[PDB]
Amino acid sequence: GGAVMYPTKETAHWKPPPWNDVDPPKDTLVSNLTLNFGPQHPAAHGVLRLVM
Amino acid sequence: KTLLHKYSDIPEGTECHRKAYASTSIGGATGLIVSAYSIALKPPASFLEGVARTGRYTFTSAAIGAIFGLTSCISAQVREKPDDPLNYFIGGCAGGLTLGARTRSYGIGAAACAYMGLTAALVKMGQLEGWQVFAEPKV
Amino acid sequence: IRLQEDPDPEDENLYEKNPDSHGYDKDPIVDLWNMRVVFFFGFSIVLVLGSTFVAYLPDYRMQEWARREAERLVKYREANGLPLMESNCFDPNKIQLP
Amino acid sequence: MLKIIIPTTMLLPMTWMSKHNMIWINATVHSLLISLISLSLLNQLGENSLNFSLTFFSDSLSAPLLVLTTWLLPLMLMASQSHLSKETTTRKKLYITMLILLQLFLIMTFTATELILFYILFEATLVPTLIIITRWGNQTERLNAGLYFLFYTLAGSLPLLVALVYIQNTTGSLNFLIIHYWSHPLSNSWSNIFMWLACIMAFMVKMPLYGLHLWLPKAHVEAPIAGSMVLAAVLLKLGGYGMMRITTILNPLTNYMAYPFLMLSMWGMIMTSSICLRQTDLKSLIAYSSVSHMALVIVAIMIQTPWSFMGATALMIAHGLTSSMLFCLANTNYERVHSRTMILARGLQTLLPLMATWWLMASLTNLALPPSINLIGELFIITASFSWSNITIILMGMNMMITALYSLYMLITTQRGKYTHHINNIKASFTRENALMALHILPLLLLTLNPKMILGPLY
Amino acid sequence: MPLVYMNIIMAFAIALAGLLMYRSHLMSSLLCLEGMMLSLFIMSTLIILNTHFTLANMMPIILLVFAACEAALGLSLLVMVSNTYGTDYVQNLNLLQC
Amino acid sequence: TMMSGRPGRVPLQFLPNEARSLPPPKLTDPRLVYMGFLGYCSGLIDNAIRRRPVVSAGLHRQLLYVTSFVFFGYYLLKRQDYMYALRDHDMFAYVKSHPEDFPEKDKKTYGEILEEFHPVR
Amino acid sequence: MNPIIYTTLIMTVMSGTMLVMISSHWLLIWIGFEMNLLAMIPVLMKNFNPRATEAATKYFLTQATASMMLMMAIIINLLYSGQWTITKMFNPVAMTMMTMALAMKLGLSPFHFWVPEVTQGISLQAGLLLLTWQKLAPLSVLCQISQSINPNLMLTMAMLSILIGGWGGLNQTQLRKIMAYSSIAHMGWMTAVLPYNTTMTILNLLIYITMTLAMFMLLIHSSATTTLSLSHTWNKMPVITSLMMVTLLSMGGLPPLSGFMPKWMIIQEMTKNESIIMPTLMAMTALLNLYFYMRLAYSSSLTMFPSTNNMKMKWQFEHTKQMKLLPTMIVLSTLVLPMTPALSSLN
Amino acid sequence: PFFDVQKRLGLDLDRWMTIQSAEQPHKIPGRCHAFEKEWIECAHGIGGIRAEKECKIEFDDFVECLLRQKTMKRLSAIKRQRDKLIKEGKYTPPPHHLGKEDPRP
Amino acid sequence: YGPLAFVLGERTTRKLTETSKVITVDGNICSGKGRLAREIAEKLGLRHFPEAGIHYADSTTGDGKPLDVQLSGNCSLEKFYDDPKSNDGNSYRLQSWLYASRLLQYADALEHLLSTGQGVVLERSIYSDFVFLEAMYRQGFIRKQCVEHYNEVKKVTACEYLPPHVVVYVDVPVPEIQSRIQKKGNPHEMKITAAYLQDIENAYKKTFLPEMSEKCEVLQYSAREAEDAEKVVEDIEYLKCDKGPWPDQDDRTFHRLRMLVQNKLEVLNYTTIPVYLPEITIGAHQSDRVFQKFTELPGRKYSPGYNEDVGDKWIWLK
């Protein structure tokens, strides 16, 4: 029932493959770019620091 | 192939030093190839570690080749029977003992003696009888 | 560690249900007919009829034929003074030595 | 030969389409009739073999073995009835089908006229035997025993396949008749030496040779009763048949190459007979005795003399019968007490008198009490070896003494002494078991009256 | 063979070595594949032009078409790998082993 | 290799017109009967896999199995015979065309030939 | 994937193989290989998993490198000969490069590392396509160029393939990886006879395809990807596991099963050419494949492993989908030995 | 497994580009059309095994036309000899080679 | 249904309508959920599936009469009530078998909805089954490893199917449920502890209701409110759950789901995952005996329609 027969010490720790699918490793993989739209921006009316 | 030609060209049971040198070169080449494959497949942690592994494998292979050639040629000289496979068997068992010493294990030494000596005797027999490991297609 | 049925007791003696079990099965009729088939077709047929067949098998090994031929050859050779058994299996003349 | 082959093949549809009640009865009846048909093959022309067809031929060597196999099948069914009673109808039919396929393969192996076909059928026997051992064995070690049996035999066989193909390429034919008639002598070269080794080693493995016999104890101990019966009676004899057949090709090198196997067999017979003295399992003891007798057979084959060959054939047949009977006798005790330990069941002569007589007769045959065919074969082999070397008598006589000792030690321990008090499940022996033992014993004793039947072609 | 053939074959060898020696990113190895394709285009074009194989001056264009097909396949796989792991690093293609 | 480049071989032709000279395989050939047996075993295995009655269910399906296997086997046997016959034809033609390479050998009776006797002692 | 798109992609793979097997121009053969890769990559990922994407990426990288090497070999042969036709290759370096590329496509060691990983990553059906159909085109190209092939290189690759395929399988408890390693070993068997007789390679390919189709279809029927999952099958569908045991025995090469004939004929052909050591070593090394086959058989059919309570529910229902060709595939894989002389039809 | 569907159905799917001597647009000749034609005609219907040795002269001429290895080697040797003579001072290029005469139209 | 049909143009979306919905009426033991579920199915013209029991698969297969416990289920709810902590492992066998039955019922309900377009009302579902498991684990009836096995099976299996559009929870306070259990008078049920019901309620409200509310809207009714079935049906009729999976689903996903649901064995494939827990692991001998007994059951030896014993005919040409 192991992942590999005749397992070694390192492989023994390794878990067997998932039955259906691998778990999603979603962990802060996408970091949205943060932009200071203003104040100096022409479209910010000069005094708006829109953090987007 | 030049190393194999070098080992073959020296007459059996003669110029034992040159035969031993050729066997050592062959062993070193085989060890270098094995070390390259080991480094690729199983990565070494450091460049120094890779160099150490290469040196260990290469020296083991070269020692095996040198012992095989030296013992085989010396046995051929002393017995004075050039074409006997027993000389190759003795050389192969000596190589296996050298491998056991390098691995610091008696069991490796004995198993290597048996298998390697038998393989070397078979190689000598193939030389004598013209056995072809790779046969040109003739049908 | 698992849900498994208790080990079955030693297989029930066929004698208990049928004292004259004869073995060969649980059902007595099949037991009797199995015993009858075995006894007939091996002992009565194969052993006795087969043994008789082997005993009177025609002598195709030519033992009697060999004996008769040897008797004829011995009588002829002794009558004619020829040696009883010639030392050469094949006539020397036909052989061409190197 | 189709007179025997086709009915054996029809045995399978009958078994599969038979009623659940009637499987054993039909199989036994028709197998016995087939055995009766096989008795016709015993009539052999002295000079020439019975060449039925291009594919199949029979001689004074193959005929006895074919008769033995056909006889063995019904005894195997009778023995296997008891422990397969609980099994479902489909599994019982599959077991019978495996036995029938094994008989068909063995018959074709013995009657085959081409060495390549002989190889195909001789290796094919592994599959049904492996399935029997590893599916209907009663111990966890049945799988390891199956692996050992299969791999020992295959490692021996495959170089034989290579050698046979090479022979086909060089000589041009693998038909035994052509090979015998042409049979150019071999030369003492390393290539011919290795060809000799390749030809011999597979049969040397099949006939348990000392150092290559490890599979036999595991397989015989761990196999079901029927599988042990076939392995002892017939499957081992395939090696002897092939070695006697194959030896024609390797004429001169046999003298030079025989010494290692000759010495191994001669010393191993003593070693294994001694092993039998201190074995604690009845089946294992029987298996080691089989090993010793097959070592005698190997010596006979290697010596390559006519008397040795006649003794080898006689010993093969006699040992097959005696070892099968011994395995069945042990199996009865195993079923009653559910253990193979010799010490556990004691004093069985008081509890089961007639089985005691069966044991006595089987042991007497095992120790070669004359005029048993066992003694005839052993004596002929011993005389041939004495001609080979007068010094051989010492080892052979020592082996005879050790064989008598271990056979009568088994008889004394199992059937003599005070009964084991706690064991209460011993029940009167069934007519089936006694009938099986009688079917084993009577043909063996009868064969003494006409021993030319089992004396082989050289007779 | 002139030296330009030497240089172009050397470029192919270098690109092959680059592809076979990954470092971290997958994009770089796809670029080495595209480099190999460019080297093959140059070699084929030089051969076909020097030998005036007129009907073979289209083979480089087909080679380029299938090279771009391969490049598209590579990028479409890299996008999925990045989505599933967050980077194009080759070390993340480690679930399947042996 | 070998027969692939034989001169005059039409590509992708199962049976050349030359084969018609050879006798057709007999419908009672053992090989064709074995092909039909394979078809019957295929039908039985199909019934077993679908959990139908093994030997009685789907007689039409078993008939189709047997007929298809026999039908293909007839042509397969014909092609096999044609190929072996072509091999023999070419071999004999080559032997005739190259007499030196296949020289007739002087036949010496066993009396003339000397074969060393190795005693089994 | 819409079934129409799936049909189109599978047809594209088959059409690329057909172009490889129908074209006399090297460019078109390479185009067929490229089409095969393009169609295959989406097929391998029909079920979207991270493992499927990893397998697709590995396969793409290996096959792209093989294709680039093959194209370089073609261009070198053109440079030294000026010929595009598939025929004797007139430059030895090009022949070596082409052999390396075609071996990598076939997964011959030392280019085998990708096969088990890809096979494990993909589904059983994609595995069947990968290990049966994909092998056809490189073997066809090798057969057409057999004369130019250096026998030493092909034989070295074949022997290494046999050894590695045998060794790796011993350590595997995953059915797909076991199949991948057995495929490596059998491909090593097929390429061994390529220098000597191509018809033997074709015969071995056909027998191997039949056996692999039977095995993969049986696994799909049992829905097992691990040895333990296959172990339960005896409780639900015993006949499947019994036929699997028979097919495994055939794969091992045991007589009288049909797996024996390819090894038999390969040994015969090698022996005719004076090759004795190589056939002996190949036959002996095949025993390891037999070992892991027998272990799988022990787990599946010969011994009855423990089941689970919830299987009782599965007993009531019956398999909905029927694989029509499975019984004929089993019969051909196991019972075709008595018909070997028919190996002159493909001849 | 080269199913010659093209030959069976008489379709020239790809054979038109197989050789340099085949028909080309506007009858533009290949750089080695003559050698390729001679080699193809020599090795036609005799099989590859025979053609590899019975048409070796044709194939060598074709290869020489394709690569010019021998011609390039001879030219390099001539240039080396000319340069060595110039260094020795015992050779002087003719005025026409030096550009002192108008080349023929 | 098949891929060929989808290629031809058999599309699930057209058959589905506003009526096409999966309604799951959940609640604690003796919460009256069955009455409301039946009334909702009748008023809204939706097929009603009675709550999955030990023998639901028996109902859907063969004769439809329940089979013996050994052959189907090897678990007893009465045993669980009488002996919650039995060493036999009956508790987790019951829980896993019930999850398998509810998974099969959900597959069948989805098949009905996707084949005929009629909505389905279910009493509890695979999404709510964890409530009993958590209560059992909290009360100590089952071990943690059993909970882990249940989690693995649910994770592998539940993801494939689409959750219900409308979740109706009938809430009855636990003491009133105890009085109801006493009034019903079933001897085994009376033994149910108050803490067990309280943990059932805690699981429902703390986990099931919030998680279900995230996907779509959940209609929570008290016992008095539940009795007015017409008002519940009207509430359902005026729900607008634009958020959630079903609006996202298109014809391709429906084809995949219908193919999955039709193949019951594929639906139950991972219920038999090879995790050797003592509670649910059956030995080889007992498994063989029970399988032989199941095969001997009338109408079960061969594939449906080929069993001559139960009156099938024309097998030779069938």
User: Tell me, what CATH number does E88's domain have?
Assistant: 1.10.287.3510
- Residues B82, B83, B88, B89, CA torsion sign: negative
Contact F53 I317 (CB under 8 A): no
Q: Would E38 be classed as within a structural domain?
A: yes
What are the C-alpha distances in Å from I219 to residues D92, I120, I205, I209, I213?
61, 17, 13, 10, 9
Give per-residue burial for I67-82: e unless 16+ CB within 10 Å, then b.
Answer: beeebbbbbbbebbbe
- Residue ranges of the annotated binding site of I for GTP are 30-34, 81, 95, 102, 124, 129, 132, 136, 184, 189
d(Cα I56, Cα I282) in Å, to the nearest integer? Answer: 21
Residues of H in contact with G81 (CB under 8 A): 63, 66
Q: Would E9 be classed as within a structural domain?
A: yes
| H7 inside 8 A of chain F by CB | yes
Chains G and B touch (3+ CB pairs under 8 A): yes
Contact F111 C98 (CB under 8 A): no
Which of I99, I153, I113 shows the shortest CA–CA distance to I16? Answer: I113
d(Cα D434, Cα I314) in Å, to the nearest integer? Answer: 49
d(Cα I50, Cα I41) in Å, to the nearest integer? Answer: 11
d(Cα G247, Cα G251) in Å, to the nearest integer? Answer: 6
Which of I292, I293, I17, I30 shows the shortest CA–CA distance to I171? Answer: I30
Chains in contact with D, where contact requires at least 3 CB pairs less than 8 Å apart = B, C, F, G
Chains in contact with C, where contact requires at least 3 CB pairs less than 8 Å apart = D, F, I
Residue with tokens 């070419």: F90
Q: Would you state the structure tokens that stand for residue G287, as one six-digit string?
A: 């025993």
Question: How close is the nearest chain B Cα to the Cα of D36, in Å?
Answer: 49
Query: Residue G319's closest chain F neighbor by CA?
Result: F50
Domain locations in chain F as residue ranges: 1-98
d(Cα B24, Cα D139) in Å, to the nearest integer? Answer: 53
Give per-residue burial for E25-48: e unless 16+ CB within 10 Å, then b.
Answer: ebeebbbbbbbbbbbbbbbbbbbb
d(Cα G61, Cα E74) in Å, to the nearest integer? Answer: 8
Question: How close is the nearest chain F Cα to the Cα of C95, in Å?
Answer: 4
d(Cα I86, Cα D278) in Å, to the nearest integer? Answer: 50
Residues of I in contact with C1 (CB under 8 A): 276, 278, 281
Query: Which technique?
Result: cryo-EM
Question: How close is the nearest chain C Cα to the Cα of D32, in Å?
Answer: 6
Q: Would E77 be classed as within a structural domain?
A: yes
Q: Would E97 be classed as within a structural domain?
A: no
| A52 inside 8 A of chain E by CB | no
d(Cα C11, Cα D454) in Å, to the nearest integer? Answer: 41
- Residue ranges of the annotated binding site of I for Mg(2+) are 28, 30, 33, 51, 123
Strands (E), chain I: 22-27, 47-49, 120-123, 166-171, 218-222, 281-282
Q: Would you state the structure tokens that stand for residue G239, as one six-digit string?
A: 């006949």
Residue with tokens 């006689």: D314
Q: Residue by residue, what is the 3-state secondary structure of chain D?
A: CHHHHHHHHHHHHHHHHCCCCCHHHHHHHHHHHHHHHHHHHHCCCCCCCECCCCCECECCCHHHHHHHHHHHHHHHHHHHCCCCCCCCHHHHHHHHHHHHHHHHHHHHHHHECEHHHHHHHHHHCHHHHHHHHHHHCCCCCHHHHHHHHHHHHHHHHHHHHHHHHHHHHHHCCCEHHHHHHHCCCCCCCHHHHHHHHHHHHHHHHHCCCCCCCCHHHHHHHHCCHHHHHHHHHHHHHHHHHHHHHHCCCCCCHHHHHHHHHHHHHHHHHHHHHHHHHCCCEHHHHHHHHHHHHHHHHHHHHHHCCHHHHHHHHHHHHHHHHHHHHHHHHHHHHHHHHCCCECCCCCCHHHHCHHHHHHHHHHHHHHCCCCCCHHHHHHHHHHHHHHHHCCCHHHHHHHHHHHHHHHHHHHHHHHHCCCCCCCCCCCCCCCHHHHHHHHHHHHHHHHHHHCHHHHCCCCC
Question: How close is the nearest chain D Cα to the Cα of B128, in Å?
Answer: 9
Provide, for chain F, the percentages of residues in helix, strand and coil under a 3-state DSSP scheme, each rounded to the nearest 5. Answer: 55, 0, 45
Tell me if B62 sits within 8 A of B33, measured CB to CB.
no
d(Cα D376, Cα F33) in Å, to the nearest integer? Answer: 47
CA within 13 Å, CB half, D218: 18
d(Cα G315, Cα E55) in Å, to the nearest integer? Answer: 66
- The structural domain count of chain E equals 1
Query: Residue D442's closest chain C neighbor by CA?
Result: C47
d(Cα H19, Cα H7) in Å, to the nearest integer? Answer: 17
Chains H and E touch (3+ CB pairs under 8 A): yes
The H-assigned helical ranges of B1-139 are 2-9, 16-41, 47-79, 85-103, 106-129
d(Cα I155, Cα I275) in Å, to the nearest integer? Answer: 14
Determine how many CB atoms are found less than 10 A away from the CB of residue C82: 11
d(Cα H63, Cα G218) in Å, to the nearest integer? Answer: 55
What are the C-alpha distances in Å from F114 to residues F110, F118, G261, I12?
7, 13, 41, 92
What are the C-alpha distances in Å from C24 to residues D28, I6, I77?
11, 60, 45
Give DSSP secondary structure letters for H12-64. Answer: -SSGGGT-TTS--GGGPPPTTHHHHHHHHHHSSSSHHHHHHHHTHHHHHHHHH
What are the C-alpha distances in Å from G332 to residues D279, F4, G336, G337?
48, 25, 5, 9
Residues of D in contact with B129 (CB under 8 A): 189-191
Residue to mutate among H27, H35, H67, with most E CBs inside 10 A, is: H67
Q: Would you state the structure tokens that stand for residue I80, as one six-digit string?
A: 């669980």
CA angle (I245 as vertex; I239, I246 as ends), nearest 5: 65
Supply the DSSP symbol for G25.
Answer: B
Chains in contact with F, where contact requires at least 3 CB pairs less than 8 Å apart = C, D, G, H, I
Contact B131 D191 (CB under 8 A): yes
Q: Would you state the structure tokens that stand for residue D325, as one six-digit string?
A: 């009977």
Question: How close is the nearest chain F Cα to the Cα of I67, in Å?
Answer: 21
Query: Residue I305's closest chain F neighbor by CA?
Result: F52
Chains H and C touch (3+ CB pairs under 8 A): no
Q: Would you state the structure tokens that stand for residue D211, as one six-digit string?
A: 């150092």
- Plot region of D406 (φ>0 → left; ψ -120 to 50 → alpha; else → beta): alpha
Angle between helices D431-449 and D353-366 (to 10 degrees): 30
**Dihedrals φ, ψ of I265, to 5°?**
-60, -40
| E80 inside 8 A of chain H by CB | no
Query: Residue G342's closest chain F neighbor by CA?
Result: F80
The rounded Cα D21 to chain-centroid distance in angstroms is 31
d(Cα I255, Cα F17) in Å, to the nearest integer? Answer: 52
Tell me if G177 sits within 8 A of G296, measured CB to CB.
no
Listed resolution, Å: 2.9
Residue count of chain D? 459
Give DSSP secondary structure letters for I195-252. Answer: HHHHHHHHHIIIIIHHHHHHHS-EEEEEHHHHH-HHHHHHHHHT----SSHHHH--HH
CA angle (H98 as vertex; H95, H101 as ends), nearest 5: 55
Looking at the DSSP bridge assignments, the partners of residue I25 are I123, I168
Q: Would you state the structure tokens that stand for residue I305, as one six-digit string?
A: 């329609």
Q: Would E74 be classed as within a structural domain?
A: yes
Name the burial class of residue E94, with classes exposed (0-12), middle (13-18) and buried (19+) by CB atoms within 10 angstroms of its CB.
exposed
Give per-residue burial for A8-42: e unless 16+ CB within 10 Å, then b.
Answer: eeeeeeeeebebebeeeeeeeeeeeeeeeebeeee
Which of G274, G262, G137, G261 shows the shortest CA–CA distance to G196? Answer: G274
Cβ pairs A/I, distance under 8 A? 9
3-state secondary structure of G53: helix
Give per-residue burial for G15-44: e unless 16+ CB within 10 Å, then b.
Answer: ebbbbbbbbbbbbbbbbbbbbbbbbbbbbb
Q: Which of residues 18-57 of F touch D (CB under 8 A)?
A: 55
Contact H4 F5 (CB under 8 A): no
Question: How close is the nearest chain H Cα to the Cα of G340, in Å?
Answer: 20
- Residue ranges of the annotated binding site of I for ADP are 30, 33, 81, 95, 102, 124, 129, 132, 184, 189
Give DSSP secondary structure letters for E59-95. Answer: HHHHHHHHHHHHHHHHHHHHHHHHHHHSS-BGGG--S
d(Cα G91, Cα G79) in Å, to the nearest integer? Answer: 9
What are the C-alpha distances in Å from D271 to residues D152, D206, D266, E42?
21, 19, 9, 78
- Residue ranges of the annotated binding site of I are 28, 30-34, 51, 81, 95, 102, 123-124, 129, 132, 136, 184, 189
d(Cα E96, Cα E90) in Å, to the nearest integer? Answer: 13
Tell me if I316 sits within 8 A of F55, measured CB to CB.
no
Q: Which amino acid is at I263?
A: N
d(Cα G137, Cα D83) in Å, to the nearest integer? Answer: 54
CA angle (F115 as vertex; F110, F118 as ends), nearest 5: 135
Residues of G in contact with D119 (CB under 8 A): 255
Query: Residue E87's closest chain A neighbor by CA?
Result: A29
d(Cα I318, Cα I305) in Å, to the nearest integer? Answer: 8
Chains in contact with H, where contact requires at least 3 CB pairs less than 8 Å apart = E, F, G
| H9 inside 8 A of chain G by CB | no
Q: Which of residues 90-119 of F touch D (CB under 8 A)?
A: 115-116, 118
d(Cα D66, Cα D233) in Å, to the nearest integer? Answer: 11
d(Cα F32, Cα F38) in Å, to the nearest integer? Answer: 10
d(Cα G292, Cα G289) in Å, to the nearest integer? Answer: 5
The H-assigned helical ranges of I63-129 are 77-82, 90-116
d(Cα D364, Cα D371) in Å, to the nearest integer? Answer: 11
| E52 inside 8 A of chain H by CB | yes
Looking at the DSSP bridge assignments, the partners of residue I169 are I26, I220
Query: Residue G271's closest chain B neighbor by CA?
Result: B139
Cβ pairs G/I, distance under 8 A? 103
Residues of D in contact with F115 (CB under 8 A): 185
* Of residues A17, A22, A29, nearest to E86 (C-beta): A29
| H8 inside 8 A of chain G by CB | no
Residue partners of D265: CB distance under 8 A and separation at least 6: D209, D210, D295, D296, D298, D299, D302
Residues of I in contact with A20 (CB under 8 A): 156, 159, 270
What are the C-alpha distances in Å from C12 to residues C78, D83, D446?
78, 12, 37
Q: Which of residues 54-83 of I touch G (CB under 8 A)?
A: 57-58, 60-62, 71-75
Residue partners of I226: CB distance under 8 A and separation at least 6: I32, I33, I35, I36, I170, I232
Residues of D in contact with C47 (CB under 8 A): 442-443, 446
Which of I266, H104, I309 shows the shortest CA–CA distance to G220? Answer: I266
Q: Would you state the structure tokens that stand for residue C30, as one six-digit string?
A: 């099949």
Name the burial class of residue I265, with classes exposed (0-12), middle (13-18) and buried (19+) by CB atoms within 10 angstroms of its CB.
middle
Q: Would you state the structure tokens that stand for residue D420, as one six-digit string?
A: 């084991």
Q: Would you state the structure tokens that stand for residue I268, as one six-digit string?
A: 């139950």
Question: Where in the sequence is the domain holding E10, given as residue range(s)?
Answer: 3-92
Q: Would you state the structure tokens that stand for residue I74, as one six-digit string?
A: 């090897």
3-state secondary structure of F85: helix
| G118 inside 8 A of chain E by CB | yes
Give DSSP secondary structure letters for E34-67. Answer: HHHHHHHHHHHHHHHHHTT-GGGSSHHHHHHHHH
Determine how many CB atoms are found less than 10 A away from the CB of residue D263: 13
| A25 inside 8 A of chain E by CB | yes
3-state secondary structure of C3: strand
Contact E96 G51 (CB under 8 A): yes
Contact D189 B131 (CB under 8 A): no
The H-assigned helical ranges of chain F are 30-49, 59-97
d(Cα F26, Cα F28) in Å, to the nearest integer? Answer: 5
d(Cα I106, Cα G202) in Å, to the nearest integer? Answer: 50
Determine how many CB atoms are found less than 10 A away from the CB of residue B90: 22
Tell me if I249 sits within 8 A of I110, measured CB to CB.
no
d(Cα G114, Cα E7) in Å, to the nearest integer? Answer: 32
The H-assigned helical ranges of F8-58 are 30-49
